[PDB]
Design an enzyme around this catalytic site. Structure first.
Site, short mmCIF file in Angstrom:
data_model
loop_
_atom_site.label_atom_id
_atom_site.label_comp_id
_atom_site.label_asym_id
_atom_site.label_seq_id
_atom_site.Cartn_x
_atom_site.Cartn_y
_atom_site.Cartn_z
N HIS B 28 -6.46 1.75 -1.50
CA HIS B 28 -5.67 -0.13 -1.60
C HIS B 28 -5.42 -0.25 -0.13
O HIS B 28 -5.42 -1.35 -0.43
CB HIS B 28 -4.19 0.64 -2.26
CG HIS B 28 -3.32 1.10 -1.38
ND1 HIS B 28 -3.08 2.26 -1.00
CD2 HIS B 28 -2.31 -0.24 -0.93
CE1 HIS B 28 -1.52 2.38 -0.50
NE2 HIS B 28 -1.47 1.91 0.34
N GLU B 52 -6.79 7.46 -5.37
CA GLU B 52 -6.44 6.28 -4.09
C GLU B 52 -7.21 7.34 -3.09
O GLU B 52 -6.55 6.67 -1.97
CB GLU B 52 -4.72 6.51 -4.26
CG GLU B 52 -4.27 5.30 -4.56
CD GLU B 52 -4.11 4.67 -3.69
OE1 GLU B 52 -2.84 3.82 -3.19
OE2 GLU B 52 -4.81 3.79 -3.12
N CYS B 137 -0.25 3.64 5.48
CA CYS B 137 -1.73 4.36 4.25
C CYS B 137 -3.17 4.36 5.38
O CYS B 137 -3.10 3.44 5.95
CB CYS B 137 -1.11 3.95 3.14
SG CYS B 137 0.50 3.90 2.40
#
Ligand SMILES: O=C(O)Cc1coc2ccccc12
Ligand SMILES: O=C(O)Cc1coc2ccccc12
EC number: 3.6.1.15
Lengths: 172, 171
Positions: B28, B52, B137
Protein backbone atom coordinates in the site's frame (compact mmCIF):
# COMPACT_ATOMS: atom_id res chain seq x y z
CA UNK A 1 12.71 11.62 22.04
CA UNK A 2 12.67 15.46 22.12
CA UNK A 3 15.35 17.48 20.26
CA UNK A 4 16.17 19.37 23.50
CA UNK A 5 17.18 16.03 25.14
CA UNK A 6 19.39 14.99 22.15
CA UNK A 7 21.09 18.49 22.29
CA UNK A 8 22.25 17.74 25.93
CA UNK A 9 24.15 14.57 24.82
CA UNK A 10 27.89 15.65 24.33
CA UNK A 11 30.91 13.71 23.00
CA UNK A 12 33.32 13.32 26.03
CA UNK A 13 36.54 11.26 26.48
CA UNK A 14 36.00 7.63 25.22
CA UNK A 15 32.16 8.09 25.33
CA UNK A 16 29.46 10.67 26.18
CA UNK A 17 28.08 12.97 28.91
CA UNK A 18 24.75 14.80 29.51
CA UNK A 19 23.97 18.44 30.48
CA UNK A 20 21.28 18.42 33.28
CA UNK A 21 21.44 22.29 33.34
CA UNK A 22 23.71 25.18 32.20
CA UNK A 23 26.22 24.35 35.01
CA UNK A 24 25.72 20.54 35.63
CA UNK A 25 27.25 17.77 33.41
CA UNK A 26 27.01 14.02 34.29
CA UNK A 27 29.02 11.08 32.82
CA UNK A 28 30.42 7.55 33.42
CA UNK A 29 33.69 7.75 35.51
CA UNK A 30 35.78 5.39 33.31
CA UNK A 31 35.21 7.56 30.08
CA UNK A 32 36.93 10.67 31.69
CA UNK A 33 40.46 11.37 30.33
CA UNK A 34 42.62 10.56 33.45
CA UNK A 35 45.40 13.26 33.06
CA UNK A 36 42.83 16.07 32.27
CA UNK A 37 43.17 19.42 34.21
CA UNK A 38 40.84 21.63 32.05
CA UNK A 39 37.17 21.15 30.91
CA UNK A 40 35.25 23.57 28.58
CA UNK A 41 38.17 26.06 29.17
CA UNK A 42 37.79 25.94 33.06
CA UNK A 43 40.54 24.75 35.48
CA UNK A 44 39.75 21.91 38.04
CA UNK A 45 39.89 24.56 40.88
CA UNK A 46 36.71 26.23 39.40
CA UNK A 47 34.73 22.89 39.19
CA UNK A 48 32.95 20.87 41.94
CA UNK A 49 33.45 17.14 41.02
CA UNK A 50 31.23 14.56 42.87
CA UNK A 51 32.27 10.91 42.19
CA UNK A 52 30.30 7.79 43.31
CA UNK A 53 31.73 4.67 41.63
CA UNK A 54 30.89 4.83 37.88
CA UNK A 55 28.74 8.00 38.30
CA UNK A 56 30.54 11.42 38.07
CA UNK A 57 28.82 14.89 38.26
CA UNK A 58 30.69 18.15 37.27
CA UNK A 59 29.24 21.45 38.67
CA UNK A 60 30.80 24.50 36.92
CA UNK A 61 31.04 28.02 38.49
CA UNK A 62 30.11 29.56 35.05
CA UNK A 63 27.20 28.78 32.60
CA UNK A 64 28.74 26.49 29.92
CA UNK A 65 25.30 25.68 28.33
CA UNK A 66 23.12 28.81 28.85
CA UNK A 67 20.81 27.65 25.99
CA UNK A 68 19.45 24.90 28.37
CA UNK A 69 16.78 24.80 31.13
CA UNK A 70 17.63 22.82 34.33
CA UNK A 71 15.71 19.46 34.34
CA UNK A 72 15.08 16.69 37.00
CA UNK A 73 17.94 14.21 37.88
CA UNK A 74 16.85 11.25 40.04
CA UNK A 75 18.69 8.34 41.75
CA UNK A 76 17.52 5.58 39.37
CA UNK A 77 13.80 4.79 38.73
CA UNK A 78 11.05 2.39 39.95
CA UNK A 79 11.37 -1.27 38.96
CA UNK A 80 9.40 -1.89 35.76
CA UNK A 81 9.98 1.65 34.33
CA UNK A 82 10.67 1.59 30.57
CA UNK A 83 13.55 4.03 29.80
CA UNK A 84 15.23 5.17 26.55
CA UNK A 85 19.06 5.17 26.41
CA UNK A 86 19.96 8.22 24.15
CA UNK A 87 22.74 6.73 21.94
CA UNK A 88 24.34 8.69 19.05
CA UNK A 89 25.98 6.54 16.23
CA UNK A 90 28.24 7.20 13.19
CA UNK A 91 26.36 9.74 11.04
CA UNK A 92 23.74 11.80 12.92
CA UNK A 93 21.81 8.56 13.44
CA UNK A 94 20.05 8.59 16.80
CA UNK A 95 19.25 5.28 18.62
CA UNK A 96 16.83 5.70 21.61
CA UNK A 97 17.19 2.04 22.80
CA UNK A 98 14.20 0.82 24.91
CA UNK A 99 15.16 -0.86 28.26
CA UNK A 100 12.99 -2.31 31.08
CA UNK A 101 14.65 -1.34 34.41
CA UNK A 102 15.11 -3.76 37.37
CA UNK A 103 16.82 -3.84 40.78
CA UNK A 104 20.04 -2.15 41.95
CA UNK A 105 22.70 -4.89 41.36
CA UNK A 106 26.39 -5.75 41.86
CA UNK A 107 27.78 -7.88 38.94
CA UNK A 108 31.12 -8.96 37.42
CA UNK A 109 31.40 -7.99 33.68
CA UNK A 110 34.48 -8.85 31.55
CA UNK A 111 36.32 -9.31 34.93
CA UNK A 112 35.49 -5.83 36.38
CA UNK A 113 33.10 -5.22 39.32
CA UNK A 114 30.07 -3.04 38.38
CA UNK A 115 27.32 -1.51 40.62
CA UNK A 116 24.15 0.26 39.42
CA UNK A 117 20.54 -0.16 38.23
CA UNK A 118 20.19 -3.30 36.05
CA UNK A 119 17.87 -3.41 33.03
CA UNK A 120 17.08 -5.65 30.03
CA UNK A 121 16.87 -4.41 26.38
CA UNK A 122 13.45 -4.38 24.64
CA UNK A 123 15.00 -4.12 21.11
CA UNK A 124 15.06 -7.86 20.22
CA UNK A 125 16.49 -11.24 21.29
CA UNK A 126 20.27 -11.95 21.32
CA UNK A 127 20.91 -8.12 21.01
CA UNK A 128 24.76 -8.59 20.90
CA UNK A 129 26.23 -6.02 18.50
CA UNK A 130 25.74 -2.47 17.24
CA UNK A 131 22.39 -3.04 15.33
CA UNK A 132 20.09 -3.92 18.33
CA UNK A 133 22.41 -3.38 21.37
CA UNK A 134 25.19 -1.31 23.03
CA UNK A 135 28.95 -0.99 22.20
CA UNK A 136 31.78 0.33 24.52
CA UNK A 137 31.63 3.82 22.82
CA UNK A 138 28.08 4.25 24.23
CA UNK A 139 29.27 4.65 27.86
CA UNK A 140 27.97 7.91 29.43
CA UNK A 141 24.75 8.02 27.33
CA UNK A 142 21.72 9.03 29.49
CA UNK A 143 18.79 6.85 30.69
CA UNK A 144 15.57 8.97 30.37
CA UNK A 145 11.80 8.46 30.71
CA UNK A 146 8.58 10.50 30.38
CA UNK A 147 6.68 10.95 33.73
CA UNK A 148 3.27 12.61 33.13
CA UNK A 149 4.04 15.96 31.36
CA UNK A 150 7.89 16.07 31.79
CA UNK A 151 11.10 14.03 31.18
CA UNK A 152 13.48 12.69 33.90
CA UNK A 153 17.16 11.62 33.67
CA UNK A 154 17.96 8.76 36.08
CA UNK A 155 21.58 7.67 35.26
CA UNK A 156 24.32 7.07 32.65
CA UNK A 157 25.32 3.91 30.64
CA UNK A 158 28.12 2.01 32.51
CA UNK A 159 28.24 -1.60 31.15
CA UNK A 160 26.56 -4.43 29.25
CA UNK A 161 26.91 -8.23 29.69
CA UNK A 162 28.67 -10.56 27.18
CA UNK A 163 25.22 -11.57 25.61
CA UNK A 164 24.23 -7.86 25.41
CA UNK A 165 20.70 -8.54 26.97
CA UNK A 166 21.52 -6.94 30.40
CA UNK A 167 22.78 -3.32 30.76
CA UNK A 168 23.79 -1.28 33.88
CA UNK A 169 22.86 2.43 34.55
CA UNK A 170 25.28 4.17 37.07
CA UNK A 171 23.14 6.30 39.50
CA UNK A 172 23.69 9.37 41.75
CA UNK B 1 28.28 -2.39 6.94
CA UNK B 2 24.89 -2.32 8.85
CA UNK B 3 21.43 -3.88 8.60
CA UNK B 4 20.18 -0.26 9.02
CA UNK B 5 21.73 0.88 5.68
CA UNK B 6 19.30 -1.56 3.93
CA UNK B 7 16.18 0.33 5.30
CA UNK B 8 15.32 2.93 2.56
CA UNK B 9 12.60 5.64 2.37
CA UNK B 10 10.08 4.60 -0.34
CA UNK B 11 6.67 5.96 -1.43
CA UNK B 12 4.54 6.81 1.65
CA UNK B 13 6.71 4.48 3.87
CA UNK B 14 9.91 2.36 3.70
CA UNK B 15 11.42 -0.81 2.19
CA UNK B 16 14.43 -3.13 2.67
CA UNK B 17 17.33 -4.28 0.40
CA UNK B 18 17.59 -8.11 0.73
CA UNK B 19 20.48 -8.17 -1.86
CA UNK B 20 22.02 -5.83 -4.52
CA UNK B 21 19.00 -6.62 -6.84
CA UNK B 22 16.08 -7.44 -4.42
CA UNK B 23 13.94 -4.82 -2.58
CA UNK B 24 10.88 -5.74 -0.41
CA UNK B 25 8.09 -3.34 0.76
CA UNK B 26 4.43 -3.07 1.87
CA UNK B 27 2.11 -3.02 -1.16
CA UNK B 28 0.00 0.00 0.00
CA UNK B 29 3.06 2.42 0.29
CA UNK B 30 4.13 1.92 -3.41
CA UNK B 31 3.44 4.92 -5.71
CA UNK B 32 0.53 4.24 -8.17
CA UNK B 33 2.01 6.70 -10.76
CA UNK B 34 5.66 5.91 -11.75
CA UNK B 35 7.91 5.37 -14.83
CA UNK B 36 11.08 4.47 -12.80
CA UNK B 37 12.30 3.44 -9.30
CA UNK B 38 15.91 4.03 -8.02
CA UNK B 39 16.74 5.28 -11.54
CA UNK B 40 15.78 1.99 -13.31
CA UNK B 41 12.90 2.09 -15.80
CA UNK B 42 9.83 0.09 -14.60
CA UNK B 43 10.17 -1.72 -18.02
CA UNK B 44 13.19 -3.58 -16.48
CA UNK B 45 11.69 -4.31 -12.97
CA UNK B 46 10.00 -7.64 -12.05
CA UNK B 47 7.15 -7.04 -9.51
CA UNK B 48 5.83 -10.04 -7.40
CA UNK B 49 2.84 -9.04 -5.18
CA UNK B 50 1.08 -11.31 -2.62
CA UNK B 51 -1.45 -9.17 -0.69
CA UNK B 52 0.38 -6.53 1.43
CA UNK B 53 3.87 -8.08 0.59
CA UNK B 54 5.66 -6.86 -2.62
CA UNK B 55 9.11 -7.93 -3.93
CA UNK B 56 10.95 -6.01 -6.71
CA UNK B 57 13.75 -7.72 -8.72
CA UNK B 58 15.97 -5.17 -10.67
CA UNK B 59 17.98 -6.19 -13.81
CA UNK B 60 21.16 -4.47 -12.55
CA UNK B 61 22.92 -4.12 -9.16
CA UNK B 62 21.38 -1.05 -7.42
CA UNK B 63 23.13 -1.77 -4.06
CA UNK B 64 26.43 -3.53 -5.00
CA UNK B 65 27.86 -2.74 -1.51
CA UNK B 66 25.47 -5.40 0.05
CA UNK B 67 25.62 -9.23 0.41
CA UNK B 68 22.41 -11.27 -0.12
CA UNK B 69 20.50 -12.14 3.10
CA UNK B 70 18.14 -15.06 3.91
CA UNK B 71 14.42 -14.13 3.19
CA UNK B 72 11.82 -16.58 4.69
CA UNK B 73 7.97 -16.82 4.62
CA UNK B 74 7.38 -15.55 8.22
CA UNK B 75 8.96 -17.30 11.27
CA UNK B 76 8.07 -19.97 13.92
CA UNK B 77 5.45 -18.96 16.48
CA UNK B 78 7.18 -17.52 19.55
CA UNK B 79 10.18 -16.02 17.66
CA UNK B 80 11.06 -12.54 19.02
CA UNK B 81 11.63 -10.37 15.91
CA UNK B 82 12.89 -6.80 15.73
CA UNK B 83 10.97 -4.30 13.53
CA UNK B 84 13.67 -1.87 12.13
CA UNK B 85 11.81 1.49 12.19
CA UNK B 86 13.43 4.64 10.70
CA UNK B 87 11.91 8.14 11.39
CA UNK B 88 12.52 11.37 9.37
CA UNK B 89 14.24 12.81 12.58
CA UNK B 90 17.21 10.48 11.94
CA UNK B 91 15.97 8.22 14.80
CA UNK B 92 16.40 4.44 14.52
CA UNK B 93 13.82 2.46 16.66
CA UNK B 94 14.35 -1.34 16.83
CA UNK B 95 11.27 -2.71 18.71
CA UNK B 96 10.93 -6.33 19.99
CA UNK B 97 7.78 -8.15 18.72
CA UNK B 98 6.59 -11.65 19.83
CA UNK B 99 5.39 -13.39 16.64
CA UNK B 100 2.22 -15.54 16.60
CA UNK B 101 -0.09 -17.18 14.06
CA UNK B 102 -0.74 -16.41 10.40
CA UNK B 103 -4.27 -14.91 10.42
CA UNK B 104 -6.70 -12.41 8.89
CA UNK B 105 -7.08 -9.67 11.51
CA UNK B 106 -9.54 -6.82 11.95
CA UNK B 107 -7.13 -3.84 12.47
CA UNK B 108 -8.91 -0.40 12.70
CA UNK B 109 -11.83 -1.45 10.42
CA UNK B 110 -9.89 -3.39 7.71
CA UNK B 111 -9.01 -7.05 7.08
CA UNK B 112 -5.26 -7.62 6.84
CA UNK B 113 -3.64 -11.04 6.18
CA UNK B 114 -0.18 -11.84 7.59
CA UNK B 115 1.74 -12.97 10.68
CA UNK B 116 0.32 -11.47 13.88
CA UNK B 117 2.68 -10.08 16.51
CA UNK B 118 2.52 -8.32 19.95
CA UNK B 119 4.92 -5.44 20.80
CA UNK B 120 7.04 -6.22 23.96
CA UNK B 121 7.73 -2.52 24.89
CA UNK B 122 4.95 -2.48 27.54
CA UNK B 123 1.68 -0.79 28.57
CA UNK B 124 1.97 2.42 26.51
CA UNK B 125 4.57 4.31 24.42
CA UNK B 126 2.77 7.47 25.80
CA UNK B 127 4.84 9.79 23.53
CA UNK B 128 7.95 7.64 24.22
CA UNK B 129 9.72 5.88 21.28
CA UNK B 130 8.00 2.51 22.06
CA UNK B 131 5.35 1.95 19.33
CA UNK B 132 4.64 2.18 15.59
CA UNK B 133 2.91 5.03 13.63
CA UNK B 134 1.27 4.90 10.12
CA UNK B 135 4.43 6.37 8.43
CA UNK B 136 6.44 3.22 9.51
CA UNK B 137 4.76 0.80 7.00
CA UNK B 138 7.29 -1.30 4.99
CA UNK B 139 9.87 -1.51 7.83
CA UNK B 140 11.36 -5.05 7.90
CA UNK B 141 10.91 -7.81 10.57
CA UNK B 142 14.32 -9.47 11.32
CA UNK B 143 15.87 -11.94 13.82
CA UNK B 144 19.30 -13.52 14.44
CA UNK B 145 19.49 -17.32 13.94
CA UNK B 146 22.88 -19.03 14.42
CA UNK B 147 25.27 -16.46 12.77
CA UNK B 148 22.76 -15.17 10.19
CA UNK B 149 20.21 -12.37 10.09
CA UNK B 150 16.87 -13.61 8.71
CA UNK B 151 14.29 -11.20 7.22
CA UNK B 152 10.76 -12.62 7.42
CA UNK B 153 8.38 -9.81 6.23
CA UNK B 154 7.35 -6.10 6.22
CA UNK B 155 5.25 -3.89 8.57
CA UNK B 156 1.66 -3.82 7.14
CA UNK B 157 -0.65 -2.63 9.98
CA UNK B 158 -1.03 -1.86 13.72
CA UNK B 159 -3.95 -1.32 16.10
CA UNK B 160 -4.81 2.08 17.66
CA UNK B 161 -4.00 0.60 21.12
CA UNK B 162 -0.59 -0.10 19.47
CA UNK B 163 0.01 -3.65 20.90
CA UNK B 164 -1.07 -5.91 17.87
CA UNK B 165 0.94 -5.60 14.59
CA UNK B 166 0.75 -7.43 11.27
CA UNK B 167 3.91 -8.59 9.34
CA UNK B 168 3.05 -9.25 5.64
CA UNK B 169 4.90 -12.36 4.34
CA UNK B 170 6.02 -13.80 0.96
CA UNK B 171 3.67 -16.29 -0.85
O1 LIG C 1 25.38 21.21 20.13
C1 LIG C 1 26.42 20.56 20.20
O2 LIG C 1 26.39 19.32 20.26
C2 LIG C 1 27.76 21.32 20.12
C3 LIG C 1 28.10 22.34 21.18
C4 LIG C 1 28.30 23.66 20.96
O3 LIG C 1 28.78 24.28 22.11
C5 LIG C 1 28.83 23.31 23.12
C6 LIG C 1 29.26 23.46 24.42
C7 LIG C 1 29.20 22.33 25.25
C8 LIG C 1 28.69 21.13 24.80
C9 LIG C 1 28.38 20.98 23.44
C10 LIG C 1 28.40 22.10 22.61
O1 LIG D 1 6.97 -16.77 22.79
C1 LIG D 1 8.04 -17.22 23.22
O2 LIG D 1 8.45 -18.38 22.99
C2 LIG D 1 8.92 -16.37 24.15
C3 LIG D 1 8.32 -15.12 24.73
C4 LIG D 1 8.65 -13.83 24.44
O3 LIG D 1 7.89 -12.94 25.19
C5 LIG D 1 7.14 -13.73 26.06
C6 LIG D 1 6.24 -13.30 26.99
C7 LIG D 1 5.62 -14.29 27.75
C8 LIG D 1 5.79 -15.62 27.47
C9 LIG D 1 6.66 -16.04 26.47
C10 LIG D 1 7.36 -15.08 25.79
Amino acid sequence: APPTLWSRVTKFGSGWGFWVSPTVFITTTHVIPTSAKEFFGEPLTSIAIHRAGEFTLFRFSKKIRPDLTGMILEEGCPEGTVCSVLIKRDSGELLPLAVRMGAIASMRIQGRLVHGQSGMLLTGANAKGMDLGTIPGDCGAPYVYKRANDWVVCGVHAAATKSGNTVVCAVQ
